[PDB]
């Protein structure tokens, strides 16, 4: 599995401002990663950064944008999925990280 197409769709049509957007979309193509996640500042879902998830370490690594280099499960607050037709993200009830997860927030003190 991968969610690269969902993420490209969200970045293109929801989150993002053209020269930055293109820079980020370029980062995604050079990436060999399968699972990408968007970091938001808060529950209003404004883009901060883009991460890739390692299944082996369970850690999120920053690929682009404004955010910490590494995000662990303890640091994650909320998790979200993208809805393409509605052009918005919706909060998922807390659960183990999985491929359905497209975006997240982190604990506030981490900023």
- The DSSP code for 9 is H
Elucidation method? X-ray
The tally of domains found in the chain comes to 1
The H or E element containing residue 10 is: helix 4-10
Give the list of residues 6+ apart from residue 99 with CB closer than 8 angstroms, or none.
1, 3, 35
Three-state DSSP at 64 gives strand
| Domain of residue 40, residue span | 1-111
Residue carrying structure tokens 């690594």 = 61
What's the CA gap between 89 and 72, in Å, rounded? Answer: 22
What's the CA gap between 17 and 54, in Å, rounded? Answer: 29
Tokens of 21: 């957007």
What's the CA gap between 21 and 62, in Å, rounded? Answer: 16
What does the longest C-alpha to C-alpha distance in the chain come to? 35
Q: What is the CATH number of the domain that holds 47?
A: 3.10.20.360
The H or E element containing residue 27 is: helix 18-30
The H or E element containing residue 25 is: helix 18-30
52 and 35 Cβ atoms separated by less than 8 Å: yes
């Amino acid at each position: 599995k991968s969610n690269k197409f969902i993420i490209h769709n969200a970045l293109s049509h929801c989150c993002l401002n053209e020269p930055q957007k293109n820079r980020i979309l370029e980062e995604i193509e050079k990436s060999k990663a399968n699972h990408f996640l968007i970091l938001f500042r808060d529950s209003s879902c404004q883009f901060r950064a883009l991460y890739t998830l390692s299944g082996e370490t369970e850690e999120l690594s920053r690929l682009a944008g404004y955010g910490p280099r590494t995000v662990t499960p303890a640091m994650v607050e909320g998790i979200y999925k993208y809805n393409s037709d509605r052009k918005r993200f919706t909060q998922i009830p807390a659960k183990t990280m999985s491929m359905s997860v497209d975006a997240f927030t982190i604990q506030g003190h981490l900023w």
